[PDB]
Structures are given as structure tokens and as C-alpha cells.
Amino acid sequence: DRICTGITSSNSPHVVKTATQGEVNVTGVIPLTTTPTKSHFANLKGTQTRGKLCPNCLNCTDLDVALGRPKCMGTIPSAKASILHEVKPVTSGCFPIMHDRTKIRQLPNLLRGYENIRLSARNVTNAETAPGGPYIVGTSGSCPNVTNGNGFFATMAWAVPKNKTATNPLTVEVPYICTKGEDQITVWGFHSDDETQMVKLYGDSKPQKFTSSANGVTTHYVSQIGGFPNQAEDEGLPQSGRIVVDYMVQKPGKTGTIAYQRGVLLPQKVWCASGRSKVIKGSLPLIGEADCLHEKYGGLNKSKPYYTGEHAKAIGNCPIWVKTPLKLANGTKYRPPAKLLK
Amino acid sequence: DRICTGITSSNSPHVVKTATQGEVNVTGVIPLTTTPTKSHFANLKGTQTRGKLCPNCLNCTDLDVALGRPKCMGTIPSAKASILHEVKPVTSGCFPIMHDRTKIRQLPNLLRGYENIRLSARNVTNAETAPGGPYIVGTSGSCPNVTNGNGFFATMAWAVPKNKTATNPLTVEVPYICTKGEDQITVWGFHSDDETQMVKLYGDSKPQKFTSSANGVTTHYVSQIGGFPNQAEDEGLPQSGRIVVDYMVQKPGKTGTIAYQRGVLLPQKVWCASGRSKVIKGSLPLIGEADCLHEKYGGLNKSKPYYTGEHAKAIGNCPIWVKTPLKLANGTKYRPPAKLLK
Amino acid sequence: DRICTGITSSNSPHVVKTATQGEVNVTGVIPLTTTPTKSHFANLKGTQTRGKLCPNCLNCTDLDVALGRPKCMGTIPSAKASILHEVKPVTSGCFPIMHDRTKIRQLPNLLRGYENIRLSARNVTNAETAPGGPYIVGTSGSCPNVTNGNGFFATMAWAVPKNKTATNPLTVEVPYICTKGEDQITVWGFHSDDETQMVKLYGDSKPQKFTSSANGVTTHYVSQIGGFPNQAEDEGLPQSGRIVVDYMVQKPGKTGTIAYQRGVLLPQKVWCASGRSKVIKGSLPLIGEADCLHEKYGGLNKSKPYYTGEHAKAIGNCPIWVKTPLKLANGTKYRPPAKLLK
Amino acid sequence: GFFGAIAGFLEGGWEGMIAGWHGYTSHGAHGVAVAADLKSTQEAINKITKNLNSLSELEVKNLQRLSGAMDELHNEILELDEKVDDLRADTISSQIELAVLLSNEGIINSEDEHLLALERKLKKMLGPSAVDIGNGCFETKHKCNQTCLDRIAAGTFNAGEFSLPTFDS
Amino acid sequence: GFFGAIAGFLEGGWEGMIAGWHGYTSHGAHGVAVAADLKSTQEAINKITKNLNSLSELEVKNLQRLSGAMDELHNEILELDEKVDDLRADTISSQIELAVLLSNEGIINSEDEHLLALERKLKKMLGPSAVDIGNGCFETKHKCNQTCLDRIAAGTFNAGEFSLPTFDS
Amino acid sequence: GFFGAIAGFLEGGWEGMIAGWHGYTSHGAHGVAVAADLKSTQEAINKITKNLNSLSELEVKNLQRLSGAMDELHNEILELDEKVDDLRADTISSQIELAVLLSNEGIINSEDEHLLALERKLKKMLGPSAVDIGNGCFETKHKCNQTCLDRIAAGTFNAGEFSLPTFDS
Ligand SMILES: CC(=O)N[C@H]1[C@@H](O[C@H]2[C@@H](O)[C@@H](CO)O[C@@H](O[C@H]3[C@H](O)[C@@H](O)[C@H](O)O[C@@H]3CO)[C@@H]2O)O[C@H](CO)[C@@H](O)[C@@H]1O[C@@H]1O[C@H](CO)[C@H](O)[C@H](O[C@]2(C(=O)O)C[C@H](O)[C@@H](NC(C)=O)[C@H]([C@H](O)[C@H](O)CO)O2)[C@H]1O
Ligand SMILES: CC(=O)N[C@H]1[C@@H](O[C@H]2[C@@H](O)[C@@H](CO)O[C@@H](O[C@H]3[C@H](O)[C@@H](O)[C@H](O)O[C@@H]3CO)[C@@H]2O)O[C@H](CO)[C@@H](O)[C@@H]1O[C@@H]1O[C@H](CO)[C@H](O)[C@H](O[C@]2(C(=O)O)C[C@H](O)[C@@H](NC(C)=O)[C@H]([C@H](O)[C@H](O)CO)O2)[C@H]1O
Ligand SMILES: CC(=O)N[C@H]1[C@@H](O[C@H]2[C@@H](O)[C@@H](CO)O[C@@H](O[C@H]3[C@H](O)[C@@H](O)[C@H](O)O[C@@H]3CO)[C@@H]2O)O[C@H](CO)[C@@H](O)[C@@H]1O[C@@H]1O[C@H](CO)[C@H](O)[C@H](O[C@]2(C(=O)O)C[C@H](O)[C@@H](NC(C)=O)[C@H]([C@H](O)[C@H](O)CO)O2)[C@H]1O
Ligand SMILES: *[C@@H]1O[C@H](CO)[C@@H](O[C@@H]2O[C@H](CO)[C@@H](O)[C@H](O)[C@H]2NC(C)=O)[C@H](O)[C@H]1NC(C)=O
């Protein structure tokens, strides 16, 4: 009489990978993979999320807040997780900017990159005593106040010169100004207007040249006088003219240098930013919470160790991407049922 | 009487790697490695190859075609594999360019990077009505026609001003112009000439300034009047002067801006390019076909899974590089022949 | 009577990782990990170390040597290992530079990157016959000689113009000049001074413009006339004025182009550099020798194959970084002592 | 596997052991009995569980946006960042695929060790009167129907229930 | 290997089995006979073949030029792209080296399992009259010359050809 | 391990074998004797040593500063270089962790093979009069005190010292 050892025969629909035996069939498997689905973004659990540079300086753009617009000036906190919702952000009024002639659009997206950001603790450069004639810090309607009046970006001073005269390039030397080992983001620009209005506000009616230097990087601009572009991302008709605006990143302890002429929107309130926040491209009504933010799939919480789908940047406690669905053999290699015995 | 189990003793010239036993000798081995040899480049099987931006606009350079030279204007297809044969491409005539003063040389190599490219579907900016005086779209011998005459790069308009007068910087606003989410590559430049000829063609004989702005990137040029460099990559003697040419990459939906004076070769026919072609450094008489293009070894078809040699960029169905020749043990660890038995 | 096989029970304080059995206790372990300690930097064994661009042109800065200062001109060798000790290097006198307005500070750190470097084998551009009027190669005290006198950076010529007159931009064409497939690092700049002194030395007292072009990269400067910054990194009182200096990297066979006016410190002695030296951030009294230089831990010699600690760049025969301390099981899984027998 | 093939085991599934994966068969006048050892299977199920825990420990850095690289100004950098992200994803994925492969091979190959273990558990409790074939089977001097077999799977068997010798602990 | 050394097997090559890698020897008045099992060796040759197929599945992204990075204008980017290419090549190469190492170790270490399998195939067909030593060898009550041995390698043997007992299927 | 549990071995440490990791016990009127085989343990110690040498061969490119990327001018490149350095460090670290894990698992799992080898060394030298249980133990027809056991660990034993049969080489 025989008493033997044997293994089972069973339903083995799952196929697994094996180096020695090639692809084998198996009783059961524990899948390690999943294809998540596109859902909305949420609050990264262990850290803190952003998307609006400011919550309590409500009804604005991110860019508006970046530029230092009158009402859009809220004391804004930290994160260590940030969502990038507008790849090319827009302004919501104030004085008409010719956005596309500089890198200025991305200024919020740059700021977003830091943990700690702050409007200012002063303003860098005396707008009145600035090189070139004594200036009257121009202000403009088209940029209301808390009380109404005329506004001009806390960011920059609208240096309109009394003693109206043409000027050979003047140099300001925008100093560091900040606390700690923060960075400084200086913002500035130049106003230009039509032939007639140019002579009115400044004693010159020809293209004005502007050159900046910071961390070895030089930029050079030449103003436009006539036929400005069909006003957009503005409010209401100082349409005679426009502003070209640019930013300047000053690393800790370093000095910037703006050579300028007429229409110079000198810098004033300068950002100081520090730390590194983890940034990702998302969509921003941030509903509830997830474990891990995926650029595509979005708010998504970890179930299995690996995931299948579209690879993309993701932050937080994420499953790791994998080329193919992966299964862990939880059973026995398929054996046919046996009567091949005697 | 004994009946035992035993293993063989045999020729075991091949040595293999083993974690537990160190380096062991083995009966046979299946090598997984090879050192390919430098051979010519060929047509990447599963995709489609380039090397000449255009086949049917024959006898030219790639740069010539890039610049929009009169005869070098062939309706050019797609690839998804491209070969980069000239690291620093040359022009084959037309008006003498001062190539080295801008990034213009690489323009083909940039274009090559895209799957879909196209000469134009229009021309951007009215050469006649361009800011500054009414222009007569200059044409020049040294750049023949299909019929002979005077040529000037479909790319750009030779804006020669009637009413010859000096000009403060004028701004054009080079618009997007393209179909789909393509990119636009705008091309432009400025002609300069000797003292006398400068006053003749334009009413001014002093260095002329030129500034462009696109996607936040600014460039600034100052023309040369005298002692131009020993003409090269040209045809025949409008040697009085030269052209400095540059390109401007407009991403989808974005506007470029050229501030300019006298000698302005305005843009006209503008490239639209889309898709991504896989590019590699090669040599270009493309003979027959291979499986995988290697920067060094070149046309090369997969035999074994891994390869030894020089690492380099490679596209297609390639073997993967490996530090050392690798062998798969196909046999038994070396045992000495046995009479150590009783 | 029973004779059995058994394994030991012993002190098993060490815990190890195992895929099948989870974390197990083990008799003994061979640790593969270590946390090195911060110690000084030393001479990388198999290669050759740098830190001072020059040893025998003693008492100087690296920048001083870069700039071609009179006494700081030592015939300097090779390495294949280099230490970067000053992230933002300083000058030790000569004519006062306005360092922060260009990328010039990093010039040594760039040079350091090459194996082979050399002061010059000539000087590029005739200082006298340079475009613009005949120049008297200005020299200045504040920059002593081997014998005392007036010095000005072997690097550059202080092109002071006899026939004092204002000048429309003039173009020089800085040629390649070098041996082999080396790179060329051209150095240049512009002197500026107060209103009165400007008219004295050059016939013009207004902001002077300067534009360079090399390998498609354009830079543009505008001189300052008044209120120069509180002199620093200088010697002794030609405080009327300052120098802004910049460098230009010419790849093999390529020509540079400087458009300039008044105050032009033309280039002269031009660096040729070749090869690639392995560079790392360190601190530079180089004491004795190590096996492997770590940015943090510093001079450090290999004991175990892996290391725990702070990841950082490291060169030479280094242990490889690892997230967690790793041990190799050298013994038996913990078994409790046995009387669970009958 | 390669062991069972050479050392003539039966590549024979026994549909019927509804419970365990591995156990004992039993052959005679009664026909063929079948049993499943409830310790070989819980030991197999445990191994797999731990392997799952090991496979699920791997931590890999997050992989996010470049802080200073701007969406329209630094596109050539941003491209190289896309390439880096892709190559990371690819490399680790291929490593994960390898980890699991080795894991699988191991789990699969183990079965023949369970069988070889189960067989030694049997040799002991069948006593010295039995005869080991080499098959993973035993020639016994007594009958073994389902109740007998079930007692071998439970470890509650006595060769001595049927007057034969025994190994005493 | 470490098994054969401890459990006193013979680290003995038998030049002469021209065919298989593993088989049987045979010792007596006739001297020493040698045979090679043609199933242990085709099972070994198959394993290796599949391992080769597994090793040859690994796909790794192509690794090409940066589309927007230009040969004279973006050299600092292009350098970082060279570095990336090199580090990729290095990482995957080291992973491939590991995959093969594990593969090799496995293929090599398997031999002692073949031997242990072959031995069980023998214990069965030599019948219950034989005596297992522990060596991987058997003391038999009958002579076994080359014709006898060749019949054990073929699996066509009968202890009963020489009037002795047998295990019946 | 999973083998010893199923095939009822003793998960029993024998504190007392001060020398080897693995060896023999011995049970009777004399009580319990203990010995350690000095060949199973030097074979285990060797394996580990080589594994250490294998683990210590891995070469990985140096990882240094970008030559043309300058500390204040190219910060967006330098950042992407930090990212690259970090991701390299992470990937290889995770691979090294895997190599060692497999190494450990192997070293640990091997013990039951040593035991199984040691047991075959015993079956031979105890002779044909002994009885293999399946336990990794043997029922003998003679007493075996410490001096007898020490002679089994040394391989210097003769079943015949006590008039019983023997297997002759
Ligand atoms: C700028 C201006 O004065 N425009 C007012 C005016 O516009 C037309 C009118 O002057 C007319 C007179 O001949 O000429 C037109 O000029 C051009 C024409 O545009 C060209 O196409 C053609 O080629 O040549 C013509 C002749 O030169 C003018 O277009 O009339 C309108 C309607 O009545 C007024 O709204 C304009 O006044 C400005 O209105 C805005 C609101 O819409 C503001 O209230 C302006 O007040 C500020 C401001 O808030 O921005 C007050 C600031 O203190 C001041 N800043 C400084 C530093 O002085 C600014 C600044 O001067 C202007 O914005 C410059 O454009 O104005 C109010 O002046
Ligand atoms: C430019 C020109 O007119 N050159 C022709 C001429 O050259 C010498 C001659 O004029 C002479 C007269 O005193 O003076 C020399 O001037 C300089 C000297 O170079 C300096 O070294 C010194 O310092 O000062 C001197 C005094 O100023 C001239 O060098 O003579 C030669 C030989 O006879 C002619 O070939 C030149 O005419 C041009 O020839 C070329 C072919 O070689 C073309 O056919 C030109 O025709 C075009 C053209 O095809 O490019 C026709 C175009 O319609 C026209 N474009 C526009 C917008 O007007 C261009 C354009 O004017 C020129 O290219 C500008 O250089 O010419 C033909 O004029
Ligand atoms: C530059 C100069 O001449 N300074 C000397 C002088 O300075 C004051 C003095 O001239 C005074 C006269 O009215 O006016 C002051 O001018 C300004 C004032 O600064 C402003 O604040 C105000 O707004 O307006 C005033 C009126 O314009 C001057 O500041 O006096 C001092 C003390 O006596 C002298 O040291 C100055 O002479 C120079 O001294 C230095 C050493 O300190 C050198 O020895 C100079 O010699 C060189 C040199 O070595 O650099 C010799 C070179 O050959 C020469 N190079 C060339 C190309 O000509 C240079 C070069 O001219 C100067 O460096 C330019 O500043 O000088 C020596 O002249
Ligand atoms: C082993 O598994 C495979 C699949 O893993 C089974 O065959 C598959 O049958 C299903 C039923 O819809 C199909 O989806 C698959 O396409 C089939 N396989 C393939 C690769 O085409 C197979 O029946 C299982 N069992 C056995 C005994 O092989």
C-alpha cells in the first residue's frame, strides 16, 4: 500500500513570470498593481498645500498678487507642497501690461517654488531721490485703492520726472535688502506712451532704452511709442500707454543693477522668499485630502505598492510606477489533474 | 556493489561569476555580449529616417534650406528618426552671412528635432507696410532665382527704405501665425555695408542697433560698417556688405518682438514645426537598413541582448550596454577527473 | 538511541533583513556600512590635486591669477582632481572692479574645470591698431609691477585714446588663437570714471555702451559715470573710477565679437584650456592623502564597500552611499535553546 | 519541477484536496485517498505574505518639478528634466520587475521542498516497518483508508494502532 | 558544492560520460561503469534556455539627443545630458550584472539538486533489496556492469531481471 | 525554516556547541550529547566570505561637479544636477539593498541544507544497521556517548568498533 506526498490541482487562471520555467500558470495571485483613475486634487496629508499664493487677499490672480496690486496684498503663509494650476498665468486688471515681452508671467510660478514668501519689509530704492531728476511717484487710476484713487503696484514706483528732459542712461544699484539666506525677487519695468503723451509726462518722445544686470544675467529693452497692442488683461482706458514689466532674482548677498531712462517704473517693494516647496502641475479647487498627488491621476491614496498607467511627477506617499501589471504568486504552479498513475 | 550518481568532467575553459563560490570554471557558456564594429548608418526599421532636411530640393545645404534660399525650397516630409551629420553646418552661397555672430548655424539641427516641418503657409509681417518708412522689398543678385534675377531668402524681407533717413528704433510684433500646437521658428537679420553704400541704400552711415524679445529671451546686436570679414560661404562679390542673421523660437500662441533700425531683414516666411523626431549624431550616405542606430558603431542589428564597447546614444531596437562581457553558464562547474575513490 | 543533526543556539543581538522570513535575529554579522566623520581634505591618490590655480605665483587670489594681475602670473600645471574652495572668489587688489555686474567672479571656477590651462602664447588684438583711434595702452598704478610702476592685467589692454573724441560703436573680432582643440577664455571690460575725468581721458562724458557676441550668446553693458560703489577688493585710491570686467568662452575654431566705445579694456592675453579635471567643493589646506574626497566628510579612505551618512559629490575610490546601515549575515538564524524534546 | 521530473515524482494535480495546496495521497483496495497537510500550506501562505511585505518596503524619492526652472524661459532644461524623470521611472520599474521575478521563481520552486519536507514528516510517523521508494511514497505493511490518511495530515497517527513498530519521542 | 562537501559526495568528475552532464557510475568486479541520464541533462539545458529568454526580455528606454538643446549655445545643458546618459548606462549595466550573477549562481547550485533527484530515480528502480548509504550511492545484492547501468540511465531496468523484489506502479 | 517546520525537525538551538554552528546531538542513558561538525561550519563561513567579496566588487561612476556650470549663473542647471545626483544615489542604494537582501535570504535559508548534508554524512558512517527516521535523526543498535559523538563530528567513526556492519570505500 502506498502513502504519497502530492500537490493540488485547481483553478489557475493567473499567469506569472519565472526565470527558470518561463511564464507559468498559478492557483492564486496577490496583485501589486492598479490603474488609478483621474480624480480631483486634494491636500497632501503629511505636509501643507498651496495653489492660491494668497487666500485672504481674495478675488485676484496669482500674478496680480505677485505684481503687488493694491487690493491683492494678503500676508501669505507657507506650504511644503504647491500646485501649479496656470502654466501661463493672467493678470486681472490694473495698468495694462504688455505681458509677452518678458519672463514676468512666470513670476508666481517661481515664487510658488519657495516655502516661505513675503510681500516686503520696506521698499528698495528711494523713488524720489532716484538718479535722474527728482521724481513724483506717479500713481494711476486703472489701479484703484482700498479707498479708490490711483494705484501702482506696491512692487514698483512710477517715476515720473518733474523737470521734463531727455536723459542719458542712469544706473540704480538695487541692493540685497533681505533677512536670512532668503532670495530676493526684485520687480521693475518701464512705462511708454504715445508721441504726445511722452513729451507731456517726460521731456522726450523717442524709444527709451533699459538694461538690467543680476547674477551675471543681462537683459536689454527698447520702448515702443506708437500702436500699442489691443489692450487686454486690463481695466479701463489709460489706453494711450502700456507697461513692460520684468523681474530680477537676487541670490543672498548680491546686488542688482538697472540702467534706465524715461518711463522707468523703479523697483520698490521687493519679495524675500526662502525654503523649498514641492511643486506639481494640478487643477485648483482643492477638495478634501489624499495621500499622494499625481500630475495626471491627481488626488490618489496608496493601496498597493506599485501602479500601472501614465508616469508623471507625483509628491507625497506614492505608489511607484511600473511598466506592466505585476502579480505575486500566492499558490502553486498549475498541474493537470492526475490519473496518469497506476 | 555500488551504483552512484555522478556528474561529468570536461573541457571547461569558460569562467563565470557566482556570489557564493567566487569565480568558477564551467563546461559551456552562452555569451550574451558582443563588441560591434564601426559600420555605416542606415534606415531605422520600424520608424522613418532623415539626414537631408529635403531630398527633392537637391544640391543644397541643410542651412540653405533652413534659410529659405531660392532654389532650396522643397516640400519636406516627416521622420521619427533623424541623423545629425554636420555639427556646425555650412551655407552654400547666396548673400554672404556673418554666421559666427549668432546661433543661426544650428537652425537646421533645431528643425531636425521635430517630426513635422513646413516652409510656410503665408509670410508674417507686411514688408512694405512695416513700421519705418515704406520699404521696397530689396532683392539681390548673389542669390539667383529659378529664372535668374536677384534672390533673398524666402525666410526674410530685405527692407530697403525709400525716403532715406536715420531712424530711432522701430518695433515690429511678429505674431504666432501657425496651425495646431506647432512651434514657430521665425528667422530675421540685418544687412550692413560700407560707409558710402550705407548712406546710399539707407539715410545713415553709423552702427545700427537691433534688439529682439521672444519667450522672455532678449538678444541685442550692433551693426558693423567697415572691414567685414574675408567673405566665405558665399557666391560672387556684393562684398561691400554682409548679413547677420538670427532665429526666434515662438512657442504656441506666443508673440515675438523685434526692435530695429536700418538694414533690417524683416521676417517673412516662418517655419511651423511639430512632433518630436528621435535625433542622433551620424554620417549621411544612408545605405540600406539596420535594427538600431548607434552614434559610434552606427547601423547595427540586434543579435545578443547586451553589448560591450563604447557607450553612446542609440535609437531603435538596441542591445543594452554592459561594463564587461557577460556569459550565461550553460553546463557544470569544473570538476577534476576522479580516481580519488576506492 | 538517537544521533541527530542540530544547529547552535547563541548570542544573536544582530537583526537582518530577509524576503521570506521578515526581519530575523542572527548569531553574527559582517557590517558593510560606516558613518564617516568630517575630516580635512587631502591629495586624491591615483590622480593629482588642485585648489590653488597656481602654487609658485604665491600670495594672490585665484581670481587675481585668472585676471592676469602683474605679480600673480605663474606657469600653472595640470590636475585631474580639483577642489573648489571659494564659491564666490575675491580679488586681492589691483584696479577696483565692480565685480557683481558680470559673471566674472566664477572665471577661476570655470578654468579649474579643465586639466590643462595656460596664461597665453601671444596676446589677441593689437591694442594700438585696434578699431577706434590709435590707443596708448594705458597702464595704472594701483597695479604695481615686478619693479613697481603701473599695472594692468596681462589679460586686458587699457585702450586710452589719443585724439579724444566720442565714438559710435566700433567692432573688434576676437579670433580663436589657440593650439589643439583647446577652449579659449577671452577676458575684457570697460573703464568708467567721473564726469570730469571721462572728458580728460576720453573725449566724451556720457554713459558708454558695450555689446559682446560669442557662441550665440549676447551680452550688453552701459557704463556708469557717477557715484561708484564704496571701493572694495582694491588697493589705494584711483577711486575716481572703476572697471567692469567680463569673460567670453570661445570653443575651438570660433570667433568672438566685441562692439565697444570709450573705456574699452580690450582683450589681450587669452587663456587656452583643455581636458577635463574632476572638481568638487572643498576646503583648502590640503594635508597628506586620502583614497576618496567627499564634499562633506572630506578626505576619506575606503574601509567597507558602502557608507551611511550625508550623500554628496565624491571623487576617487569611494564607498557607495546607502539609505540604511547594511549587514551581511555571518551565522545562523536565532533559535531558542532546546529542551522542547523528549 | 526539474526535481520532480528527474526524481520521478508525479506531475499530478490532485483536484479534491479542497483545502491545502500540498498533502498526502493514499492507494489500495479502497482506491485512492487524498489529504492536505494544514501546516505545509499555512507555512507556504506565510512565506508569500512576508515576501509581499518585503516587496512593499521599497522607498523611492518623490520626483517633482524643478523649483527655479520656468515654463516658457527654460524649456531646454525642462526637457532634460522630462528625460531624467522618464529614465528614473524606467530604471526602477525594471529593478522592481526583477525583484518580483526572483520572488515568484522562489515561491514557485519552493513547492518541491514542501513535498520533500512533507515526505519526511511521513517517513517518521509511518514507522520503521515502512519502505521508502524514492518516489515521495511509502510501501506500508497495513491498509490506509481516508480515516487513516486524515490522521497523517493531522499528525495524529500511530503505527501501533495497527500492531506495528513506532519511533518514540 | 557546499552540500556535496558536507554530505560526503564525491567532487569527482567522470570524464567518459560524453553525453549528459549528470548520470550514474557503477562499481564492482567489472571495475567502474559510467552512464549519463538523458533527462537530467535535457532538463538542465531547458532551464538555462528559459533563463536566457528571461534575461533577454529586459526593455530599457532608447536614450537619444535633446531636441531643443543646441550644439554650440547650450553646452552646459548638453554636458548634464552626457552625465545623465553615462549614469543611466552605468546603473542599468550594474543591474544587468546582478541579474546574470543570480542567474549563474542558480544554474551552478542546481547541479546538486539534479544529483539528489537522479538518486531518488535510482532508489526506486533498484528496489527494496538495495541499501541507501547517504553518499548518493547504493549497495546492491547483484552485479551491475555497463549493460545493467545503461538500463538505469534509460529507465528500463528491472530488479527482477535478477530475481529480486520490485516496486510496482 | 519552512522545511524544518513541515518535515518535523527541531527548531531547537543547542547552546553548548561552542564551536560550530551545525553538528550532531546524541540521546540515551548518558542523557544528551552535543557536537559540532567542523566542516559544515567552515563551509558556511567560506560561502559568506565570498558573498562579501561579490558584494564588494560593484563599481559605480564617481559623481562630481559639472565643469561648465557656474555657481551663480547656471543655478537652474545646477539644480537639475542636484536632482540627478540624488536620484542616482537613491536608485543604486535601492539596488544594493536588494542585492544584500537576496544575499541574506540565501545565507539564512542555506542552514537547512547544511543540516540535510550533515545528515547524509551520518547515515553513511552509522552503517546499514541504523534506522533513518525522517527527523534528521537515526535509531542506532548501540550506545553513543560524548566520545562516540565526537568521533562522528571528526569523521573518525567505525560502526564495527561496536561489532556492527559498515560501508567500505
Ligand atoms: C493721456 C490723456 O491725456 N488722455 C486723455 C484724453 O485723450 C485724448 C486727448 O488728449 C486728445 C487731445 O488732443 O488727444 C488724443 O491724443 C492723440 C490720439 O490718441 C492719437 O491717436 C493721435 O495720433 O494723436 C492724438 C493727438 O496727440 C488723446 O487720446 O481724453 C480722454 C477722454 O476725454 C481722457 O480720458 C484722457 O485722460 C486720462 O484719462 C484716464 C482715464 O481714462 C485717467 O484718468 C488719466 O489720469 C491719469 C491716470 O489715472 O492714469 C492721472 C495720472 O496722474 C497721470 N500720470 C502722470 C504721471 O502724469 C496719468 C498719465 O498722464 C496718463 O495715463 C498718460 O496717458 O493719467 C487721464 O489723464
Ligand atoms: C555697392 C556698389 O555699388 N558696388 C559696385 C562698385 O563698387 C565700387 C564702386 O562703387 C566705387 C565707386 O567709387 O567705390 C567703391 O567704394 C569704396 C571702396 O569699396 C572702399 O574700399 C573705400 O573705402 O571707399 C570706396 C568709395 O566709397 C566700390 O567698392 O563697382 C563694382 C565693380 O564695378 C560693382 O560690381 C558694384 O555694383 C554691384 O555689383 C553687384 C555684383 O557684384 C550687384 O550686381 C549689385 O546690384 C545689387 C545686388 O544685386 O546686390 C542690386 C540691388 O538692387 C541692390 N539693393 C538695394 C537694396 O539697393 C544691391 C545693393 O545696393 C548693393 O549690394 C550694396 O552693396 O546691389 C551692384 O550694385
Ligand atoms: C583722476 C585724478 O586726476 N585725480 C587726482 C586728484 O583728484 C581730484 C582733483 O583732480 C580735483 C581737481 O579739481 O578734482 C577732483 O574731481 C572731482 C571730485 O572727485 C568730484 O567729487 C566732484 O564732483 O567734482 C570734482 C571736480 O571735477 C578729484 O577727485 O587728486 C588726487 C589727490 O591729490 C590725486 O591722487 C589724483 O591723481 C591720481 O592719483 C592716482 C593715485 O591715487 C594715480 O597716481 C593717478 O595716475 C594714474 C593712475 O595710476 O591710475 C596714471 C595713469 O597714467 C592714468 N591713466 C590714463 C589712461 O590717463 C590714470 C587715470 O588718468 C586716472 O586714474 C583717472 O582717474 O591715472 C593720478 O592721476
Ligand atoms: C492559465 O492562464 C491563462 C491566462 O492567464 C489561461 O488562458 C487564458 O484564457 C483567458 C480566458 O478568457 C484569456 O483571457 C486568455 O487570453 C488566455 N490565455 C492567453 C495567453 O491567451 C489558461 O486557461 C490558464 N490555465 C491553464 C491550465 O493554462
Ligand SMILES: *[C@@H]1O[C@H](CO)[C@@H](O[C@@H]2O[C@H](CO)[C@@H](O)[C@H](O)[C@H]2NC(C)=O)[C@H](O)[C@H]1NC(C)=O
Ligand atoms: C516707499 O514706501 C513708502 C511707504 O513706506 C511709500 O509711501 C509714500 O509714497 C508717496 C508717493 O507719492 C510719497 O509721496 C510719500 O512720501 C510716501 N510715504 C507716505 C505715505 O507719506 C512710497 O511710495 C514707497 N516708494 C516710493 C515711491 O518712494
Ligand SMILES: *[C@@H]1O[C@H](CO)[C@@H](O[C@@H]2O[C@H](CO)[C@@H](O)[C@H](O)[C@H]2NC(C)=O)[C@H](O)[C@H]1NC(C)=O
Ligand atoms: C484616500 O484616503 C483618504 C483617507 O484619509 C480619503 O480621505 C477622506 O475622504 C473621504 C471622502 O469619502 C472623507 O469622507 C474623509 O473626511 C477623508 N478622510 C477622513 C477619514 O477624514 C480619500 O477620500 C481617499 N480616496 C482618494 C482617492 O482620495
Ligand SMILES: *[C@@H]1O[C@H](CO)[C@@H](O[C@@H]2O[C@H](CO)[C@@H](O)[C@H](O)[C@H]2NC(C)=O)[C@H](O)[C@H]1NC(C)=O
Ligand atoms: C578555466 O578557465 C580559465 C580561463 O577562463 C583557464 O585558464 C586560462 O587559460 C587560458 C588559455 O589561454 C588563458 O587565456 C587564461 O589567461 C587562463 N586563466 C587566467 C585567469 O589567467 C583554465 O585553464 C580553465 N580550466 C580550469 C580547470 O581551471
Ligand SMILES: *[C@@H]1O[C@H](CO)[C@@H](O[C@@H]2O[C@H](CO)[C@@H](O)[C@H](O)[C@H]2NC(C)=O)[C@H](O)[C@H]1NC(C)=O
Ligand atoms: C510676402 O509674400 C509674397 C508672396 O506671397 C511676396 O511676393 C512679392 O514681393 C514683392 C517684393 O518686391 C512685392 O512687390 C509683391 O507685392 C509681392 N507679391 C507679388 C509676387 O506680386 C512678398 O515678397 C512677401 N513679403 C514681402 C517682402 O512683402
Ligand SMILES: *[C@@H]1O[C@H](CO)[C@@H](O[C@@H]2O[C@H](CO)[C@@H](O)[C@H](O)[C@H]2NC(C)=O)[C@H](O)[C@H]1NC(C)=O
Ligand atoms: C542587420 O539586419 C538587416 C536585416 O533586415 C540587414 O539588412 C539587409 O542588408 C542586407 C545586406 O547584406 C541586404 O541584402 C538586405 O536587403 C537587407 N534586408 C533585407 C533582407 O531586406 C543588415 O544588413 C544587417 N546587418 C547590419 C549590421 O546592418
Ligand SMILES: *[C@@H]1O[C@H](CO)[C@@H](O[C@@H]2O[C@H](CO)[C@@H](O)[C@H](O)[C@H]2NC(C)=O)[C@H](O)[C@H]1NC(C)=O
Ligand atoms: C535580536 O536582536 C534585537 C536587536 O537587534 C534584540 O532586541 C534589542 O535589544 C537591544 C538591547 O539594547 C535594543 O537596542 C533593541 O531596541 C532591541 N530590539 C528592538 C527592535 O527594540 C533581541 O534581544 C535579539 N535577540 C533575540 C533573541 O530576539
Ligand SMILES: *[C@@H]1O[C@H](CO)[C@@H](O[C@@H]2O[C@H](CO)[C@@H](O)[C@H](O)[C@H]2NC(C)=O)[C@H](O)[C@H]1NC(C)=O
Ligand atoms: C601685447 O603683448 C605685448 C608683449 O608681447 C605687450 O607689450 C608692450 O605694450 C606696450 C604698451 O604701452 C607697448 O607700447 C609695446 O609696444 C609692447 N611691447 C614692448 C614691451 O615693447 C602689449 O602691451 C600687449 N598688448 C598691447 C597693449 O598692445
Ligand SMILES: *[C@@H]1O[C@H](CO)[C@@H](O[C@@H]2O[C@H](CO)[C@@H](O)[C@H](O)[C@H]2NC(C)=O)[C@H](O)[C@H]1NC(C)=O
Ligand atoms: C586613509 O588612507 C591613507 C593610507 O595611504 C592614509 O594616508 C596616510 O596618512 C597617515 C596619517 O597618519 C600618514 O602617516 C601617511 O604618510 C599616509 N600614507 C602613507 C602610509 O604614506 C590616511 O591618513 C588614511 N585616513 C584618512 C581618513 O585619510
Ligand SMILES: *[C@@H]1O[C@H](CO)[C@@H](O)[C@H](O)[C@H]1NC(C)=O
Ligand atoms: C489710497 O489712495 C490715496 C490716493 O489715491 C492715498 O493717498 C492713500 O494713502 C491710499 N489709502 C491709504 C493707504 O490710506
Ligand SMILES: *[C@@H]1O[C@H](CO)[C@@H](O)[C@H](O)[C@H]1NC(C)=O
Ligand atoms: C524670379 O525673379 C524675378 C526677378 O528677379 C521675379 O520677378 C520672379 O517673380 C521670380 N520667378 C518667379 C517666382 O516666377
Ligand SMILES: *[C@@H]1O[C@H](CO)[C@@H](O)[C@H](O)[C@H]1NC(C)=O
Ligand atoms: C614694469 O613696469 C614698467 C613701467 O611701469 C615697464 O616699463 C616694465 O616693462 C615692467 N617690467 C618689465 C617687464 O621689465
Ligand SMILES: *[C@@H]1O[C@H](CO)[C@@H](O)[C@H](O)[C@H]1NC(C)=O
Ligand atoms: C564514553 O564511553 C566510553 C566507553 O565506551 C568511555 O571510555 C568514556 O569515558 C565515556 N565518556 C564519558 C565522559 O562518559
